[PDB]
Design a protein around this ligand. Sequence first.
Ligand SMILES: *[C@@H]1O[C@H](CO)[C@@H](O)[C@H](O)[C@H]1NC(C)=O
Lengths: 50, 50
Amino acid sequence: QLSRADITTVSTFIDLNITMLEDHEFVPLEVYTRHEIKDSGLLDYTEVQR
Amino acid sequence: NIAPYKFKATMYYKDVTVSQVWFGHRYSQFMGIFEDRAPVPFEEVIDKIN
Ligand SMILES: *[C@@H]1O[C@H](CO)[C@@H](O)[C@H](O)[C@H]1NC(C)=O
């Protein structure tokens, strides 16, 4: 009696590798926050009047 | 870069205020007030304030 792995084996199937799409996490990103846009002005009427 | 160049500065001025007052029999009234911001000379900013 001999084991099943003692004889050479050939794959009769046509392998098809399937790599699922990895999960992705999106982080917040802004070129200029609303605070930066407000600060872009040279003068602010609110602060000047205050 | 939209942020304006921010730097610290010190202002020096005198609030010159000359008012005209009319004295009645039983009351006082301001016939005119002249407010002006007079600048401080370099000699005073250096030899007196600083
Ligand atoms: C992936 O597919 C290939 C054939 O494209 C196959 O040879 C391989 O054994 C499969 N599995 C792994 C883990 O690479």
